[PDB]
């Protein structure tokens, strides 16, 4: 499967004039575009090699569309202050995300369009692309406006149609970097916490895409209780890293197995300690 | 939706160099508002638009026009110094997204000299007996002649009720002097009724032309009557 | 050239389909509109469309072909009251305003079942030796040539609907100040039916 996602952050800055507007675009786990109201360019900018192949018509349209979004979010910050009876002295955050998923055949699976205000759910298009989830009474006001204007029809045309066409275009032109799996290079480290117990840490490095499952077993039952699992983190080269740790009774390091699952792995992997 | 967008004035004659403001109002909490002009063969040309309160932007033909959107409900179009090239029909629109709802329009005529403004003369022409004989229908013709500018609303009144049925009004006037930009105009309308309805003298038929000309606040130097906004009528009774 | 429509008139008999066609330059355009405008009135929305394919609303069908950058309005079972200018509008990429085409004049010709073409002289109600000439009840394929003279006035044809009888008729009006001018001559620039009834006034 594949995805295209755009992430928008609008932040009010009481003393410092115009709000901050950041836009990022991803195909799967690969960033391809950015816009930042505070950068010199005032242009949508490339962040992947493949998108630089697009000509001036593409960049002019995307720059126009992104600056149009920022103007809409400028007014949205003001409206939400009205809805929640907030003054201009506080900094507030609007977040917006939209995109589409496609299967292996590149046919539409589902669409997304959702907003948050100060880190809470505000309004989302439901999975059926026809109706809205309003998180609170402020979002109910938005919902009634959007129902009255038949907003869902035009948004659905993008999510099922245009969004899918852009993703297919990018998947073909960016195929080298987008239609790839980098298998995790796995390894293990050992750290004595005490004289009676040690830490076993199961490493997966240099993998793409980010989706991965690290599992620890002690005699074939998953240690769902006792495993610490760090957040998957970017290496900064277009790959990801992750680790999972268990504290084991020292000299019973043999008795624990780490299982790694990833799209790039023909066979799920399995590690044990080597001293 | 269209009914939610209001526009004033409906008609205005201006002297070259005069000022005016067109008012667009909508009670639909629409974020977007638009000022267009429409000229024959050109279609609708955007002058200016607004994406919200306190923000405006140039359209395709902004030069000579300014706008203000200090309040979300109102979009003002200002003509600083009226020119003959600004003679047009102006439409405003509003949208929540991109679906635009239009106001009823403003017909502006800009004149070097208001001595060229004339109200219509109106005459009603009675059905021919030959028609009543041949068809058992009776067509009345209204002629509105010698008016300038083309700021007229022609209506038919039957027993003091406005009629829509049985009426055809010329979709555009004839120029009496087609060579000239300030030519006076002629307009015809027909009202067709059953010969029975025409022959029953209980029935009253009136042709009304509402002309939009000068105000009392306009200076008048000429010998003839001041060509002010006024109704001009002609009438006939049913006859067996 | 951004939004292109042929000016027409497109002439169609009542009951037949009318296809109003529109092409646009900006391939990224996401919204497409059809507006109807009657003479001296304001644009009224007929249809919006967003996706490739069809959208129906009463007798109206819009169809969008984004690959050929081509959009149509189909009027099914066309009626004379559908006679108007149809305006195509497109929102280009990242635009916050519509681009309108210059429009297509549609005339839906009434079916005149029993044409009875005639030229009648009508006399001024308020007494005078003043008159008009009315050419009426001709078939909808008759067109009326405007005046070859600058002192003779001839209107275009006008469809009148006596809604209570469901009866539609075509008419044109001619008048002039010239003493010599006569109804029998008024419409001679025009191709008027043989068997046009000319009574004597």
């Amino acid at each position: 499967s594949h995805s295209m996602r755009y992430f928008f952050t609008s932040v009010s800055r009481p003393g410092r004039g115009e709000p901050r507007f950041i836009a990022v675009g991803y195909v799967d786990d690969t960033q391809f575009v950015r816009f930042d109201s505070d950068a010199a360019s005032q242009r949508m900018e490339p962040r992947a090699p493949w998108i630089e192949q697009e000509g001036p018509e593409y960049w002019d349209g995307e720059t126009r569309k992104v600056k149009a979004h920022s103007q809409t979010h400028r007014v949205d910050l003001g409206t939400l202050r009205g809805y929640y009876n907030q003054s201009e002295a506080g900094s507030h955050t609007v977040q917006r995300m939209y995109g589409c998923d496609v299967g292996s055949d590149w046919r539409f699976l589902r669409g997304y369009h959702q907003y948050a205000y100060d880190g809470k759910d505000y309004i989302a298009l439901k999975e059926d692309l026809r109706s809205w989830t309003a998180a609170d009474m402020a979002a109910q006001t938005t919902k009634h406006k959007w129902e009255a204007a038949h907003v869902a029809e035009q948004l659905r045309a993008y999510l099922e149609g245009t969004c899918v066409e852009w993703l297919r275009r990018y998947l073909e032109n960016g195929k080298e970097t987008l239609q790839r799996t980098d298998a995790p290079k796995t390894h293990m480290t050992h750290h004595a916490v005490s004289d009676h117990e040690a830490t076993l840490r199961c490493w997966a490095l240099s993998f793409y895409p980010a989706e991965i499952t690290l599992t620890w077993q002690r005699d074939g039952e998953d240690q769902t209780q006792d495993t610490e699992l760090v957040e998957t983190r970017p290496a900064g080269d277009g790959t990801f890293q992750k680790w999972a740790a268990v504290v084991v009774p020292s000299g019973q390091e043999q008795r624990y197995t780490c299982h790694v699952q990833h799209e790039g792995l023909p066979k799920p992997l399995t590690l044990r300690w080597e001293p | 939706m269209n009914a939610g967008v209001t526009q004033t004035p409906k008609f205005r004659v201006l002297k070259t160099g005069q000022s005016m403001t067109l008012l667009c109002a909508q009670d639909m909490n629409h974020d977007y508002m638009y000022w267009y002009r429409q000229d024959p063969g050109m279609g609708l040309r955007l002058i200016h638009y607004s994406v919200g309160e306190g923000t405006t932007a140039k359209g395709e033909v902004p030069d000579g026009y300014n706008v203000s959107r200090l309040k979300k409900q109102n979009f003002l179009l200002g003509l600083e110094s009226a020119a003959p090239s600004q003679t047009s029909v102006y439409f405003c629109a509003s949208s929540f997204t991109d679906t635009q709802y239009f106001g009823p329009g403003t017909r502006l005529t800009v004149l070097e000299d208001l001595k060229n403004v004339f109200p219509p003369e109106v005459a009603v022409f009675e059905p021919s007996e030959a028609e009543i004989s041949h068809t058992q229908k009776a067509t009345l013709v209204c002629l509105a002649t010698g008016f300038y500018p083309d700021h007229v609303e022609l209506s038919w009144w039957v027993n003091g009720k406005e009629v829509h049925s049985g009426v055809c009004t010329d979709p555009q006037p004839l120029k009496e002097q087609p060579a000239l930009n300030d030519s006076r105009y002629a307009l015809s309308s027909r009202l067709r009724v059953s010969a029975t309805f025409w022959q029953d003298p209980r029935n009253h038929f009136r042709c009304q032309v509402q002309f939009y000309g000068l105000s009392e606040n306009d200076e008048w130097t000429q010998d003839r009557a001041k060509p002010v906004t006024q109704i001009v009528s002609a009438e006939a009774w049913g006859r067996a | 050239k951004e939004v292109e429509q042929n000016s027409g008139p497109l002439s169609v008999p009542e009951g037949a389909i009318a296809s109003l066609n529109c092409t646009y330059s900006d391939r990224g355009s996401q919204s497409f509109f059809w507006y109807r405008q009657y003479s001296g009135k304001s644009p009224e929305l007929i249809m919006s469309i967003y996706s490739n394919g069809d959208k129906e609303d009463g007798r109206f069908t819009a169809q969008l072909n984004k690959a050929s950058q081509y959009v149509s309005l189909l009027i099914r079972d066309s009626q004379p009251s559908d006679s108007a200018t149809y305006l195509c509008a497109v929102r280009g990429t990242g635009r916050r305003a519509l681009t309108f085409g210059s429009g297509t004049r549609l005339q839906v010709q009434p079916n005149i079942q029993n044409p009875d073409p005639a030229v009648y002289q009508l006399r001024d109600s308020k007494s005078s030796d003043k008159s008009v000439c009315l050419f009426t009840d001709f078939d909808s394929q008759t067109n009326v040539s405007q005046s070859k003279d600058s002192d003779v006035y001839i209107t275009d044809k006008c469809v009148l609907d006596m809604r209570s009888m469901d009866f539609k008729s075509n008419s044109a009006v001619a008048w002039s100040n010239k003493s010599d001018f006569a109804c029998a001559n008024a419409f001679n620039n025009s191709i008027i039916p043989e068997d046009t009834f000319f009574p004597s006034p």
């Binding site: 755009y6 675009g25 149009a68 609007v94 406006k145 948004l155 993008y158 | 919200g52 | 990242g94």
Partner: peptide, 9 residues
């Protein structure tokens, strides 16, 4: 490519 939606909250 970005959505071209004009809708405000």
């Amino acid at each position: 490519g970005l959505y071209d939606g004009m809708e405000h909250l």
